[PDB]
Each structure stands twice: as C-alpha cells, then as structure tokens.
Design a protein around this ligand. Structure first.
Ligand SMILES: CC(=O)N[C@H]1[C@H]([C@H](O)[C@H](O)CO)O[C@@](OCCCn2cc(CN(Cc3cn(CCCO[C@]4(C(=O)O)C[C@H](O)[C@@H](NC(C)=O)[C@H]([C@H](O)[C@H](O)CO)O4)nn3)Cc3cn(CCCO[C@]4(C(=O)O)C[C@H](O)[C@@H](NC(C)=O)[C@H]([C@H](O)[C@H](O)CO)O4)nn3)nn2)(C(=O)O)C[C@@H]1O
Ligand SMILES: [Zn+2]
Ligand SMILES: [Zn+2]
Ligand SMILES: [Zn+2]
Lengths: 183, 187, 184
C-alpha cells in the first residue's frame, strides 16, 4: 500500500513511438505529504532506440505521459501500459488491479490544471540523466504535474537532449525527485 | 482529527507569505516531510512584486542574488525576523494547516552535530546543498538555489535559501521550478 | 522498517581511500518503504586526495569509495568505510549491538543486478554534483553505482571525479541526496 510501481524488471511496458518499445521503471513511494519518486528509461526498439542525430537532426525529444482518473487509476491513453502498474508485492505486483490511489496523485492546489489564470513553474521538476551511464551523454528529464487534458491528474516525462548523438542507445541512469501529494 | 504531524509546510497555495525586499513580495512554497531521521524537503519560489520580481541585468547589472532566511528557536518554532511569515508555517491539515500555532518541531530541525553553528572549529561544506531551478520553467533560465543549515546567528537552528544567477536576464520573472533535497534531522 | 542506517554525523575519520582513515564519509540511509532515501558527503582529511593540485598533478582526477555487503546486508571488512561506526542510529550515535540484518536497506537485485553476462543497464547508476568547500565554482561529480562489485551480495560505490584544474583545493564537499530501490 506504500509503493506504486512498474516492477523493476526489463520487460517492455511502455509505448513511445511503437507498441512496447520501452521499459519505464518508475517507483512512487508515499512518504506522507510527499511522494518520493525514482525513474529511469530503457528504450528497446523503434525510433528512439538508437539515436543518430546525423541521420535524423530533429529527433531531439519525446514524451511519456501517465494520465490518471479521479481515483488515481491509470488511463489507457497513457504511454505506460495498465497491466504493468500497481502496488508492490515483493519484487512483483499484486495480481489484482488497484481501485484507489488518490494519495499518490500530484496535489491539484500545488499543481493546478491549465486554466486562464497565471501558470506557475513549480509544477515542473528538471533533472539530467545520462545515456548508457556515460558522463558525456546527458539528456534532460523534465517532469510536469497535472498539465494534461483528458484526466484528473498527470505526470509527464519529457526527455530531450542538445548534443548531436551518433548511434547512442537510449537507456538511462536513474533520477530521484519528489512532489506534493493530493492527500 | 486529520492533523498531519509528519509534515511542516507553508501550504501549497500561491498566497504571498515571504518578505525578500518588501512586505509579502513572494510565496515560498516549502514542504518538510519527516522520514524518520531525515527530512525530505521540496521548495519553490514565486516572486510577485518588488525588486526581485522582474529581473533585468541590462538595467540593473548588480541585482544577481538574494537570500531567504528561516530562523528557529530551541523548540523548532519560527522566529519573527525570518523572511517567511509565521502565520501560515505550520503542520499540515489537508491543503491547509492545523488550527493553532505549533509549539514543538525539534524533529524537523537540521542536526546540529552534522551542521554546527559557526565556531572556532573547522567549518565544513556538508551543511550546504546546491540545486539548480529554472525561471518560468524555461530550460535556458537556470538559477542556483544554495541551501545552508545552521549558519545564522541569533537562533538555535536555521535554514537559508540563497538564490542567484550568472546570466544576464532581461525582463525574466523570478518564479521557479521545484527542487527536492533532504537533510539530517536533530532527532 | 522506518529506521536509519548511518555513519554517525560527527567528523571523525571513518574511511580509507588512499591511506588509513584519511576521510570521513558521512552517509545516511533512511528506509522509506520500497525506497531508501540516501544523503552523502565527504571530507578528506589527509593523504593523496586531501589537497588537489591539477597544475602539479593533472592526472589526479578521480577516486572511489566502496561499500560491500554480504547476504544479510552487513558491511564487509574490506570496504573503504570502516565497520566500527556503520550501524543503526541511536540519538546522534549508534545502537550498541552491531546489526545482524539490514536486507531492507540493500539495493534491489532485480533493479540492479550483480555483474553478469547479461546486458549492463545504466539504471544502477545515479549521477550528482557536489561542491568543494561549498564554493559554487568548484564542482565535482559523485557517481553512485549499485551492486556492481564482486566478492559481496550487495554494493554501493561512490566515484568522485572532477574535470576542472583545481589548484590546492581541499576535498571536502557539500551534501547530495538520492534514492534507490530497496531489496525488501
Ligand atoms: C556527470 C556529469 O556531470 N556530466 C557532465 C559532463 C562531465 O562533466 C564531463 O563530460 C566530464 O569530463 O560535462 C558535460 O559538459 C561538458 C561539455 C564541454 N563544455 C564546453 C563548455 C564551454 N562552455 C562555455 C564555458 C562555460 N564554462 C564554465 C561554466 C562555469 O560553470 C560552473 C562553474 O563555475 O564551474 C558550473 C557549476 O556547476 C555552477 N555552480 C552551481 C552551484 O550551479 C557554477 C555557477 O553557476 C557559476 O560559477 C556562478 O557564476 O558554474 N567554461 N566554458 C559552453 C557553455 C555554454 N553554456 C551555457 C549554455 C549551456 O547551458 C544551459 C543553459 O541554457 O544555460 C544550462 C542549463 O542548466 C541547461 N538546462 C537544463 C534544463 O538542464 C541548458 C539546456 O541543456 C540547454 O539550454 C538546451 O535546452 O543549458 N555553458 N557552457 N563548457 N563545457 C558534457 O556534456 O560532457 C555536461 C554533463 O552534464
Ligand atoms: Zn539495440
Ligand atoms: Zn509576476
Ligand atoms: Zn583539510
């Protein structure tokens, strides 16, 4: 009941450009009013598997969205597949889909949905991770809370890079952040 | 009833609660969550008025940093000469605070052995945490947030946030992305 | 369960990088369920890595501090960190019994496998930057890797490196926070 996650195996669970082209490893642990989060990404096939910006100069970013309903349940338009996201049990998931995880959602007062009122940057956390664990291959991970439509809550990960990478496999080191919880 | 003693915070609203250069010119959103012997901290800043609201280093090249101080007495109570106001610094209840001002929060204070006050002893850097946040959420607008534990005088404990930047920003509003860190608690 | 495993927070050397007890690694691990919240800093007090001068010694650019653990999460004697004051917290010191089990504080083996024939993924690494002497123009990279050492069941390795040409700069750092997925 304290951790929502993807399991930490290498089985693809995520669709960026094509079905199951990636394994998003995400762990959300509820430390009361904050969620401690840990994330990494392995792209296993398709467009973002091997970066070559000589061949493809404008392939410089992509986005992974987790959309949740009023119950904190994952919506199927999410890039992360529903079968792969649940409370922890051992090194696996519970075999039954969870019904409520409002306690893990980003707080809507802290991180309001888009509206006509002033939009503040505090709903974003920036980090840098490294491709293949190499220190000279940074990519930015921008995490944004509750800015997607078609949901009550959202966490989006945008991965972008400014270097011209040539035949670099897109699999990442791990980043930790936190966010304020809905309840 | 539903009072959260594991979290000291400013609330997550955008109501100004902080004085940098003039009364209530900013909202400091600061959440301290006690994970036992460590405090998990989440911080952002919105400046809404005065000198640090709109930065222009073409107009004012000297305006490059400012500091926000939280000073605490022996019981972990926020002193009135802090930049943050006492009115809405308290234990969490829902998205608001508990009804009455807290009297004890020693378990949220930074550890005085890890982070000693100034003295004759050698001063170590481990009482500082550096992070970079981004103005307006734009990746080409970094500013440095330097957090320092227990280096202020006239208090038992302190947490100070220094914000600075080295770029020459032109009409860049000072409102930041969020940054998470932790520190060792006093108990 | 919600406990803290740490080095104590004094500045007494507890670590051997190049010579005996030449450093104080201050490391605090706090179990928040399936994740360990980690907080780390380093003070080198003596020896090869105390005062860096890359004008006279341009090739002195990195060093490594290893914590090796057995199947019960007990620190092994050949780790750079000494066993004497690595233990569960009591006040500003430690419990009086050296711990027997801390498997719940160990890096998860499925998330971070031990070296093998299989593909080594980068997710067993965390990168951060700390600053020498608290000076904003003195960065150094702290690279933390999980479960990549041999002769143990679990490991946490800190590699400290820098790319600036430091001239007589004392290696003592600001603090860095990270987390990792817990075995249990
Ligand atoms: C694991 C790891 O850290 N890897 C890094 C590696 C690694 O260190 C080496 O590979 C190991 O050998 O290095 C990477 O970068 C090296 C690339 C080579 N390179 C070339 C240059 C030339 N510069 C011009 C220049 C700049 N400098 C010195 C800069 C001074 O910086 C410091 C300092 O004083 O030393 C760094 C400190 O960390 C700062 N302190 C603190 C507390 O933060 C300090 C203080 O701020 C000041 O001292 C106070 O005055 O400053 N020497 N020569 C070219 C150059 C241009 N720029 C600016 C544009 C690029 O940067 C930004 C931006 O827009 O401003 C920075 C933003 O943070 C970033 N945004 C995000 C969201 O991340 C943004 C975006 O990436 C882009 O806008 C695109 O969206 O870019 N800087 N330098 N210098 N270095 C490597 O690639 O190998 C980086 C790895 O991360
Ligand atoms: Zn491949
Ligand atoms: Zn404004
Ligand atoms: Zn020294």
């Amino acid at each position: 009941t304290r951790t929502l996650w993807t399991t930490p195996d290498t089985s693809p669970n995520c669709t960026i450009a094509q079905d199951k082209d990636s394994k998003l490893t995400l762990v959300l642990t509820k430390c009361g009013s904050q969620i401690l989060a840990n994330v990494s990404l392995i792209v296993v096939a398709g467009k973002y598997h091997i970066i070559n910006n000589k061949t493809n100069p404008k392939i410089k970013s992509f986005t992974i969205k987790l959309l949740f309903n009023k119950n904190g349940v994952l919506l199927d338009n999410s890039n992360l597949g529903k079968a792969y996201w649940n409370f922890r049990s051992g090194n696996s998931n519970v075999s039954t889909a969870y019904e409520k995880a409002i306690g893990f959602m980003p707080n809507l007062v802290a991180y309001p949905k888009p509206s006509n009122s002033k939009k503040y940057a505090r709903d974003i956390v920036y980090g840098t991770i490294y491709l293949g664990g190499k220190p000279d291959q940074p990519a930015v991970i921008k995490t944004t809370f509750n800015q997607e439509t078609g949901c009550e809550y959202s966490i989006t990960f945008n991965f972008s890079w400014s270097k011209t990478y040539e035949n670099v496999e897109f699999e990442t080191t791990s980043f930790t952040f936190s966010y304020i919880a809905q309840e």
